[PDB]
């Protein structure tokens, strides 16, 4: 997963372009030119093994989950470091205890527009305010202003 | 934008929430010292003949038996709470575990293993 | 879409509940009032008869 | 029956915790160290407390997430 | 520090800090195991749901009060109540907070005792104090006199006070209360088809009970009213559909109360009892107790009942004297708030019933001086 | 489960409109119900002083 | 190590290890001995073909079901099955494999202790337990609550649960179900002059039941159409030829569930069981089990049954209560989906029947706290 990006992190997108001449290798002739995994996996199934295209429809839908439908280089990255797992969950859960404790200084139990927008800002991350409400409902699922350890754990829910 | 983008900015920001604990632990740590140095009157142990000694020493195995019954009482209630959070948990896993069971099929074969068999060992990073 | 049906649901469930609230609390009110305009209406009529007895003692 | 029981449970362990302090057969410099190692132990509890503390203000906090947590799921 | 005003009650338990106007949980007093098997793993199902949980889940559960009649006969059960109240519906730790408990007039004293014995050991309270439940309401009143009529849902009790010095030979305790009239509501119901046994389904009559029922001006008027025309048969939806229409067992279920021989009692409704405890008095206090009758606890609520009681004692009483009926639209909870005030003064702060003075005397310093 | 869902928030709306009415209707007794309680309060101290007064006559 | 979900059944044979989606392999459960005399030598005949082989050879075979109505009739036949769907079909051997049968509600006991003592003594297996079919599609649905209909080929029963506590006094069991529709199918095909008799032929009419049959919105509008016009009748071509017409055959035959007079059955349809096992159900938790009726099991996948069940109950209950069908698209595997779910639980770990525990008690184990 990780360790496979981070041993390619010092190259570029040729990784790609070596996964399509391995594809031409097998799977040569592309239409959409878009997102297709189910062929190239279908056709390594054809060799004598099991037919399974539930893997198929799981790796070509590992990549599109924004809602706006593209399917990046990023994207088949995530879907490749998703579709086996091992460093995930942000590791420990209890570290995520520990860091919601430290959002709710106020000890309240319910993490507000001012802690995440404070955390953000320790942070500093620069995301718009479109973003900034699609992360605040990620977070605050029913949509009122407070986010309790479950909300927060939704809101990382494999983040890491 | 994308989402390789959005993970790495959640994990950066996993690593300055990690950098932040580790600075209250640090001022934990800290403060432990500080309030373990100042509770603690010193061993004012000088000049001193054996009658005075034996009495110091009675008196702190006083006071050492009464701090000792009041960390067992913060100890008991700790048990208590943490007790209580387990409970808790387990109520509110019942209030939200149930279809959370991990429905994951083995049909699934790992991409690793899949790409090393049909390629032998060129499949190096996987 | 079923998500949606949920929500809608309790939304209007919680609205029922707040209403019947409503429909108890005005209706002991409303008693009150009756019982005390009946109260006042006698209170008149004592008043009056009081002044007829200071009059003629 | 159990309540009072609790209490006497409570003292004898405290009273085993009190250790027999013996330093009349002990020179005055190993009266010394004797008062060292009941300051240490005192420190040792000092610190256990302490930590007490900081853990009891943890669980104090999550009981309070949890409550937050049961509100959200009324 | 601030003090725990809790009430035990009977049928509802009612807490709160003192000095606030309202309790801040009230939830009914009973504690309900499982009576099934359970099939599901891993579904969380604890062994005992107490309190408002317990109303709830009661389709499974078999529902048993702790307090039966003012007296506590299950001391565990009582003790999981209390436990639960102080830690989830208020969560306050009992180790920082004095407590005033209420209790009913003429009440066994090992009641009395054991309750204080458990406050003092399980919870390990600073201080607590046990007051009589119609001084309290009394003190919610903001009067000085009157004879204070409180029927609970456990038991009516009748204690008179003049200018602050109670009369302890007139106080007059009657059983009959609003668990009784349940009960035969629920044994009249049988008269239209509509049959409840469980002990679930005690609490659907308990609710037919409290949003229909009203109590009659006059009785055999309405009885042959309601057997004559139609007006009065309203319609109640039960938790699954199918509604059922309360002919006369409207106004015959609180009828009770004045009339105890229709659930075979010997004893005078009460609308008699008050005025007996008012002529046990002195001569020279009749007065001011006629005019200052005062109406609470929960069962006093129904509607139209302050008329009725002032019909019958107007009857009874002498011509010339004025009958006046206090009855405050905060009646429920007149307890709890002359609890809340008493808490509150000054000058009761050194009545605290101290743990050092516990551990010198024993639970028998309740009945001392420090009543 | 769309047709419900509709059906189910209009529902909703519905039971919103009757609360608020009976919100207004609770606030108005209530004020009405304070202007008699003192109105009644009137009448006690009115009766007070007729009462003394025949008891001197 | 992994845990296999076996699932008995009566008419397809389904099992799989077990944190999957689907049974690995699903396959009649069938013993059929050749019955003609055989003339080549050397074929390599075997004495009994099983499972998916004998639904290829069928043509001289005498087909055979082991398990009648849930009970197992036929030991041996049982056992071959079980031998084959552990080693030919999984590839596996049950020396280091816990299993998870399932078992219809209401079934004598001697046919759990039997299972329990082959699975223990003949295949060896480390531990296994026996659970209800329908918990374990109470579980697929993800429901805790819920009165489930598990029609599957042999019976149908109808468990009702409410919040994990199974409730043993409501269970409905009818001996109605796929096999008997089949068999009705075929004895009312005979109507238009296509005869089935052999065995082998009854497998047809299974097919022509699966892929023509659907349950009507209302029987006798349907009956007067198919009467008049001519847009319902479907054809069907046989495994030889010879197509075939099915008129108004098609909503006959499972109308035989609403309808169990059809068959010469007394009792009520699956329409009218489980309103009546709600009712006997307590009064407070009937709105939750109108609100989650599911349905499971293969029979209960006819087109247009969710809306012929739920406009008859509908039709029952009264008129305030909603009531709610749950018929997810994998109704024929859920009761398997559900077991690998259990299986899969680690709450659930420590329940199994460990053979050191029956080597002490005996088969009789079964019936113990080990349920
Ligand atoms: N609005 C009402 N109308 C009629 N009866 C009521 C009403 N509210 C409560 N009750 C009756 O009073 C009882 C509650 O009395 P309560 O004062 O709580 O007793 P306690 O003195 O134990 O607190 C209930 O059991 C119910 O039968
Ligand atoms: N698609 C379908 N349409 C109609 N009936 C079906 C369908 N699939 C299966 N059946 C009926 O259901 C039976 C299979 O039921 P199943 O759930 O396998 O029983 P079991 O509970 O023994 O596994 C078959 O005998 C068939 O008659
Ligand atoms: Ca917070
Ligand atoms: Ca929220
Ligand atoms: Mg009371
Ligand atoms: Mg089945």
Redesign the pocket.
Known sequence: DDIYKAAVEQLTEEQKNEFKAAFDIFVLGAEDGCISTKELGKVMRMLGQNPTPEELQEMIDEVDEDGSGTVDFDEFLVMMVRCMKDDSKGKSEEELSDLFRMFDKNADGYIDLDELKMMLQATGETITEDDIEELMKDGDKNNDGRIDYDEFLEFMKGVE | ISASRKLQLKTLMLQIAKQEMEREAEERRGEKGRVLRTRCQPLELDGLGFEELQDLCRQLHARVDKVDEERYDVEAKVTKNITEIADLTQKIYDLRGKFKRPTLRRVRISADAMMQALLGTRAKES | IESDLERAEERAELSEGKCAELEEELKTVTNNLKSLEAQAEKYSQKEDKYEEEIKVL | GKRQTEREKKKKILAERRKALAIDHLNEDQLREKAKELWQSIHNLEAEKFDLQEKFKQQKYEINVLRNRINDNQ | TTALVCDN????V?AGFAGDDAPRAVFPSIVGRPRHQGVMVGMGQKDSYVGDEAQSKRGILTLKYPIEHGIITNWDDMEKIWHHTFYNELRVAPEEHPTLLTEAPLNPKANREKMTQIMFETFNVPAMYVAIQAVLSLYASGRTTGIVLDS???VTHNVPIYEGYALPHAIMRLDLA??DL?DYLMKILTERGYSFVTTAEREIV?DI??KLCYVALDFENEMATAASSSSLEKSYELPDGQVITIGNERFRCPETLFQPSFIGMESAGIHETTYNSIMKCDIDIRKDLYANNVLS???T??PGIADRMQKEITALAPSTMKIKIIAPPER?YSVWIGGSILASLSTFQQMWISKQEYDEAGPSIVHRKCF
């Open positions: 009650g009977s049928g509802l009612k609970g849902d456990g609003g668990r349940t308990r009970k409290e606890g929960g069962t609520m129904y429920k």
